[PDB]
Every structure is written in C-alpha cells, then in structure tokens.
Amino acid sequence: ETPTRVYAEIDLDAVRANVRALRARAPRSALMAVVKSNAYGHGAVPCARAAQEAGAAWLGTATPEEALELRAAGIQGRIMCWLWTPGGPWREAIETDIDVSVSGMWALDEVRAAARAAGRTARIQLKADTGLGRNGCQPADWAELVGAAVAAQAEGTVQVTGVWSHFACADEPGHPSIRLQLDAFRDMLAYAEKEGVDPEVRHIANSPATLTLPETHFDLVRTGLAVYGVSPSPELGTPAQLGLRPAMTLRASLALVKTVPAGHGVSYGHHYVTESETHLALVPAGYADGIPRNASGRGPVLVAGKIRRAAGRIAMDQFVVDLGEDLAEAGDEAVILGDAERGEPTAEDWAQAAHTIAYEIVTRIGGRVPRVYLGGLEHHHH
Amino acid sequence: ETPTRVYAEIDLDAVRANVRALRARAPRSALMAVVKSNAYGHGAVPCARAAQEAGAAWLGTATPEEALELRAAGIQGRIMCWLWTPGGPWREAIETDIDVSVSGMWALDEVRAAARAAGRTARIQLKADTGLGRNGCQPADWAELVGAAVAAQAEGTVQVTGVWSHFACADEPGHPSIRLQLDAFRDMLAYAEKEGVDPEVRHIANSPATLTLPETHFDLVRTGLAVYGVSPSPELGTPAQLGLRPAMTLRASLALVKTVPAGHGVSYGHHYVTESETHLALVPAGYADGIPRNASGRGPVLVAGKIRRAAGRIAMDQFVVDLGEDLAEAGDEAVILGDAERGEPTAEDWAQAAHTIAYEIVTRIGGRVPRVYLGGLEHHHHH
Ligand SMILES: Cc1ncc(COP(=O)(O)O)c(CN[C@@H]2CONC2=O)c1O
Ligand SMILES: Cc1ncc(COP(=O)(O)O)c(CN[C@@H]2CONC2=O)c1O
Ligand SMILES: [Cl-]
C-alpha cells in the first residue's frame, strides 16, 4: 500500500499547473517539457502525460532510449532527443518519428544511412555551440556541417526541422556570456537560414532563460526543472515568487526513538556527541536512497512539529536526528523535503546543506524509493 | 547489443575471489555477504548468487523488500534484514524464513502478532547499541528487551537466533571507540545469555573490523564493501594491498571531439576556460548516472591513453574533458572507474575528488546505467 519506510509523493496537479504558468510566461512560443533522467526523478511517463495534458507541445529527453520509452508508452506528439553516441538506434528513432539532434558530421552520416534502411526521412535539428563548449557545432565547423545538411536534405534523406543552442550561465541574472551567446545564436541561425535551411522551430532557452529573458523565447522553450516546481537558482527567486509549485514530497517513517546519556557518540566517526541526556530518532533513508552524504550534520528534516538537523554522518540506509526534549514514536512521519508553503524543508534547502544545486537533489532520488502519484488523471499513474 | 553510451561491467570472478579471500581471513566464523542497496550498485541477485556459491553461508540486506526479492529469485539459505518500520511485511518475511532484527519493543510485539498469524515461529536477532547511537537497544533498555524476548520465546512465538552490534569507527585503525564497543558487546551478550538467550550467531564485525581486528569475528562476520573489491579506507591500504579485486568497471563512449579556440568557456558557470587552442571531448555520463557533481574539475577519466580531469562543472547527463594536443574520436572508449592494476582511475580516486568515501561512489551509480556481467556461472547473470 503506502510505503512504510520512505516514498516520493508526486503531485501531478502541481506539474500541470506549473506548465500552465510557464506557458503564460512565454505566450508567443511552444512549450517543450524536458522529461529526461526519469523526469528529473519524478517519473518519466506520468509526468510526460501530465505535461502534454496541461498544454506541452513537445517532449524532450537526452538519450534515444528515454525517447523510445515515451513512444512505447503510447505518447503521441513531437518528441526530441539529443545525446547520441556512434552506433545508436537511429533507425528505431526515425521509425517512431522522433526528432534527432546533430552536432557533427559523424552523426549526420549515421542518420542518413539509417534513413535509407528505414526507407524514411529523418527530422534532424542542427545544434550550434554558441559558447557553452559542451555538445554542438563550433562556429569554425558550422559552414561545413550546414552545407552537408542542406545536401542530405536534397537527397531526400533528412529534413532539417530545427536550429538550436544551449546557455551556460542563464541562471546568473546578468552574466555577460548570456548576451554573447544570444548574438552568436542569431548570427549562426541567419547563416544557416541563408544557406537553405527553413526551420520548423528556433530555440535556445532553458528554465532560467525562459523565466527571465523574453528575447530568448523564439518559437520554442525547453523547460525542465521549472516544470517540477523547483527554482533554477536562489538568485532567480523561490518557487513561490516564481509562481511555481513543488511536485515532489519525500516522506519517511521513524524506525526508532530512544533516550541516550550525555556524551554519547552518534554515527560513523562519531562526529556528533550528545550535549546531554536526549532523545534520538532514526530516519530510515540514506545516501543509497538519494540523501546526500555531504549534507551530513546539516540536512534539514521536519519531525514532531519542528525542523531537525541530521546528527553526524549520514549513512547508506539511514541517519539520526536529535529531538532533544521533544518526544515522538516509531512510525511517526518525517518530511525530508516538500513544500515551503506548508512549512517543510525544500529541494533548495538540501542543495545548500550538501553544497550542491537543487537540480541534483531531486534527480538523484534513488530507485529503492517508490513513487506515489496523486492528482492529474488516473492513467497518468502508470 | 552492448551499451553505446555508458555501462557498468561487473566481474563475477572478482566477487568469488574476494569472498574466498575474506573467508581465509576469518577461518573460524561464518561469512555474511551484505548485498543491500542492489549489491552496492553491482546487482543484487547476480552478486548474491555469486557470493553464495563462493562460500557465503548468510546473506544480509537492509530492508524486507530487498530480502524478499532474493527469495523471489530462488535464492535459498539464511538471509537477514535489519531496517524495519511499523507496518512492515512481518508476516511475509516470517513465512519466507527470513531472520529479522528487533531493536525495540514495538518490533517484538509486531513480530509476535505476525508469527501467530503465520502459524510459525519467527527467527529474531537482538541488536544492541554498543556506541554507534544508530539502531539497536541502548544498554539501559537491554534488560527489558531481553526480558520481553525470552518470554515471547517461551510462548513459541519467536526464537532469538542472534545477538549483534555495529562499529562506529572500525575503519580508523586504533580508535578508542573500537575497544569500547567490543567490551560493551561481550558484556551485553553475556547478560542476554544468562537470562535465557542461546544465540545461533554472535556478530559485530564489518569489512574493516574483519580485515583488522580478528577478535571481532565471533560466530559471524558481515562483509559488504570488501566483497566488491574496494577498500573501506585508504588508511587500510589499497584493494591490491588487501588482496582484493575490484568488481566494477564504468566505461563510456565519447559523443564528440572538437577543436576550440583559446580562452573558450567550458560548461555551466564557465568555471573552466581553455588556456589555448585545444581538443575537447564530451563524455556522455553525468550526475543523473552517478558521477558526483562535487567532483567538478577533479574527477579522473582515462582517455586516448592518458588520465584527464573533468573540465569544469559536471552536468546531469554529461561532462567534458580537455585532451590538449591529443586526438580521439566519437565512439572511442573512456574509463571513468576501474582497476588501478590496469592503469585506470578507481573508486577511491573519485572518492577523493568528490570529497566523500568510496562506499558512496560505487553505490550511487544510477539505474540509467546498464550492467554487463562477466565470469561467474552462466545462470548467475539471469536476473
Ligand atoms: C540541452 C538542454 N535543454 C534544456 C534543458 C532543460 O533545462 P532546465 O532544467 O534548466 O529547464 C537541459 C537540461 N540541462 C541540465 C540540467 O542540469 N544539468 C544539465 O545538463 C538541457 O541539457
Ligand atoms: C548493519 C550493517 N552491517 C554490515 C554492514 C556491512 O559493512 P561494510 O560494507 O563496511 O563491510 C553495514 C554497512 N552499511 C553501510 C555502508 O555504508 N554506510 C552504512 O551504514 C551495516 O550497516
Ligand atoms: Cl519501543
């Protein structure tokens, strides 16, 4: 029934509301709900169905496998994936009508052959490296790749449906690289559009860019994190101020509550020692479940009406908390992260406690943790 | 057929070799292979099967669900799980002949009711908190818990098959807490025995205690990490020094290789800027796959014959490495973590880079990452 140890509660109603709120932010563009990495830990399919429901025109994933799983789940509509390696399932992707990203000639050649075998045309989108220095084609190789693409288009083997890029510091309001990439993108797009490419969509914005720079919207925006009700960065504001609602609530039940004398060590390395006779509670969730070990001694948890802090080192499967004078009992609910509007710890709180970013917190929630859905439509729960 | 992006290759022969090596260390005790957390990221069923056939007489998991997955996979023999919460599948565990741990009064009473409903006697193991401050019964409550158990015993509802504990700093050779806990264990164990408990097994030793303090072996030793070929700590030496063979090898295929101008920013935040014109390579694995973001700028990877450091911020699905003048092409192999003997970066190397411990490195390798099994017996990698 309802997991007795720990479980991740996913609110499909918060998801749908976030996508409606995000659509309103970029009224002139289409919305792509990025659901890679199991929808940032919330559950790929359920969240993809909910997103499409609230009005998402596109669905995006990193790997082909992720995109094929969406199709296999009966999801219709445009889907795009961009992280490819030589020898990937191009043919499978083409046959399921999935837009593929091309960054180098090696990719283009593999998609052209796969198209032949499939006896079908592949919808490809050209990625320009405007400054991030990650994936994508560099300005120096752009003219060549562009020429090869319009050539393959003529051979009826491919069809260039898009031209896109990705930001490096869009989450740093005001960073000089942002404008630099926006200009580099405008310039490389024009050169492509002048060489014979008529794109279906033009896109470069992610969640932070979408929430702050309307000049980056173009035809489509790729929103991942914001969809799950988490703010890209604190400099952009809290989900509340952003009009977003947190989709995930992580809950656990106490496994033990006992009294210990003063001077008693707690956990590995005994990095925590009780100050006086106190009450300790055992939370049965550890770093194997996604609770960062680097949050040792700082991780916030809500127990018995008050916020508690991880006591000492966080272990593989569990960690303790010092309830002090307060009392509680085994089976009592413990909220590790959820909604700030309900006075609970948040994804951002843990990011700060573990010296990382909110993106990693929600995304790394372990497979050992069951997910429970509420809201949305019944079929979303599959 | 074989993962084109990233994958974990698990060497089942290394597993068999380690448990065999571990048994030679504690000749007069039974060995419990701890395969919780999906065998520390190596694959629970294949590893449980392998260790069993190599000589492990007991199997240990943290949760009931993990222990029941083993039974469901046809694994026979003694199995124990210790992380229970109210409402757990007591009835189901008891019926599948799994040894459960009881550290409080709430548990004891739930298992009694469960045993009655199953029409069978439950095998329970009493845990004593000798200094960890985690689970287990505090010394001052031992008397009462031991009292309620020997009673439930007389009613034929339960049978106390074991008494045990867990060390806080056995991985720190010569720590005063070690002896402190060992002493406490003997003392609490003795009391239990005197009041009526006849344990089938007495245990307190984990991997580090097993490799260092033979006086902690007792009847059973619970080894987890060492079974997979990784050392509990640099302080104890390297796997090679401990005579252990690493079982996991994380490999990836470059997704791109390109030349970039001098002074070009790399990844989020631009925390890395090329010092000159150079070749950049994209490794298609990121923190969603288990590569810690905390190793940004430090995590080692073996590419084109040399060890390279993560250039800048590590992302959710990938990260970049600067190859300098060297050349490589999309599809070429990169070893993220493997065997130092093969000249590859290791679990410890990454533990250092991410300011954490090797335990968390191997364990958090994601589900998005496929596992390929080599060696062992064919039927082992069927699940
Ligand atoms: C190419 C691309 N587009 C869009 C997104 C969506 O971004 P948001 O989640 O910010 O809306 C991502 C995710 N980028 C991530 C997130 O964390 N690490 C990454 O590489 C991406 O890689
Ligand atoms: C109760 C218990 N027994 C045995 C083991 C196996 O120990 P080794 O892996 O050191 O051999 C562990 C380790 N559990 C882990 C591992 O890391 N943190 C923990 O709490 C444990 O918690
Ligand atoms: Cl109790």
From TrEMBL, chain B:
Domain (Alanine racemase C-terminal) ranges: 247-374
N6-(pyridoxal phosphate)lysine (covalent) PTM sites in chain numbering: 36
Biological processes, Gene Ontology terms: D-alanine biosynthetic process; peptidoglycan biosynthetic process
Reaction catalysed by this enzyme: L-alanine = D-alanine
Active site: 36, 268
Binding positions (substrate): 134, 316
Pfam families assigned: Ala_racemase_C (PF00842), Ala_racemase_N (PF01168)
GO molecular function terms noted in the UniProt entry: alanine racemase activity; pyridoxal phosphate binding
Residues with N6-carboxylysine modification: 127
Protein known as: Alanine racemase
Organism: Streptomyces lavendulae subsp. lavendulae
Lineage, uppermost ranks: Bacteria, Bacillati, Actinomycetota, Actinomycetes, Kitasatosporales
Gene that encodes the chain: alr
